[PDB]
């Protein structure tokens, strides 16, 4: 039984969450049931991978000077075999493939 986060004390009924919690990943429960972000919002480094993705999308999927700098920052802070860096690498690879498809379609 969950209280709504914005409850100003006038909620008539307490209700079950929409997501099934039993057997679910912790990260999902935090976000969907407890309304807490997976990364701490008050830390700059928490936003870097998000920002990196946005930079990739802004430059038609190519790794520009700005995207490279941020990539290097991610690599330097989180490390060579970090989840964050692997996600960044994945984004680069998928965007390159998407662009190749787009070029083939244009020709």
């Amino acid at each position: 039984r969950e209280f709504e986060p914005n409850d100003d004390g006038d909620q008539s009924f307490l209700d079950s969450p929409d997501m099934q919690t039993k057997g679910s990943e912790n990260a999902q429960i935090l976000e969907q049931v407890m309304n807490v972000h997976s990364t701490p919002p008050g830390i700059a480094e928490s936003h870097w991978l998000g920002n990196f993705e946005l930079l990739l999308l802004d430059n038609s999927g190519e790794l520009d000077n700005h995207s490279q700098v941020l990539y290097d920052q991610i690599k330097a802070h989180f490390g060579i075999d970090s989840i964050e860096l692997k996600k960044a690498d994945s984004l680069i690879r998928i965007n390159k493939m998407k662009n190749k498809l787009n070029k083939i379609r244009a020709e």
Binding site: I80, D81, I83, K86, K87, D89, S90, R93, I94, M97, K98, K100, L101, I104
Partner: protein, 210 residues
């Protein structure tokens, strides 16, 4: 694990003979270049990046004193007892954490292909390959147990997370097939399989792609 190709003996192993000599005497830094040539910076058993590392006797020095300065027997394993205690997979766990084991009931990655015996599910678990019975099943089951390839949470977690990062790409490549011809498509699969050669958990990534 990956199927390994052992090339050539280093010269330093010729001098030291078991009974007379003990493993403290040999220079490890002479041996490593040939192992790093073979393995490519990654652990023999779990395929993680080597940072804390040690040279590992596949059949141990206590039980098998004869097999000590023998080039077949040696492997580069993750973890290092000198640098820190409490390491819970691969070489260290084989000796300390796992109890009694038959050395014959283990996949040796130079002798054999592990792809015959092991399967890497995208949920991150290593399981015996489909259609194994008796001796081949026992070997697949024991290799998993003795090197702790699921039971180490650090490894399980890392391997799972590595695979789930690429699964948007696996689903995206294969959707583009009704679009494209076989000549151009098979290049792109080959380009993706070229990338993963220099990545951690490359067998787990291969089974996701192929």
């Amino acid at each position: 694990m990956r199927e390994l190709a052992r090339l050539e003996r280093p010269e330093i192993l010729d001098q030291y003979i078991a009974g007379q000599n003990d493993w403290m005497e040999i220079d490890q830094s002479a041996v490593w270049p040939k192992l790093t040539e073979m393995q490519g910076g990654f652990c023999a058993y779990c395929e993680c990046r080597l940072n804390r590392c040690h040279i590992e006797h596949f059949r141990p020095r206590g039980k098998f004193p004869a097999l000590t300065f023998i080039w077949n027997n040696l492997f580069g394993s993750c973890g290092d007892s000198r640098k820190s205690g409490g390491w819970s997979r691969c070489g260290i766990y084989k000796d300390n954490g796992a109890g009694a084991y038959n050395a014959d009931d283990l996949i040796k990655p130079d002798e054999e292909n592990p792809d015959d015996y092991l399967l890497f599910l995208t949920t991150g678990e290593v399981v015996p390959a489909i259609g194994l019975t008796g001796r081949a099943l026992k070997k697949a089951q024991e290799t998993i147990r003795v090197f702790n390839l699921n039971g180490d949470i650090k490894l399980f977690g890392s391997r799972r997370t590595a695979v789930q990062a690429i699964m948007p790409n696996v689903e995206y490549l294969y959707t583009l097939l009704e679009e494209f011809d076989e000549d151009d498509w098979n290049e792109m699969l080959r380009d993706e399989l070229e990338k993963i050669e220099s990545d951690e958990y490359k067998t787990a990534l291969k089974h996701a792609w192929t």
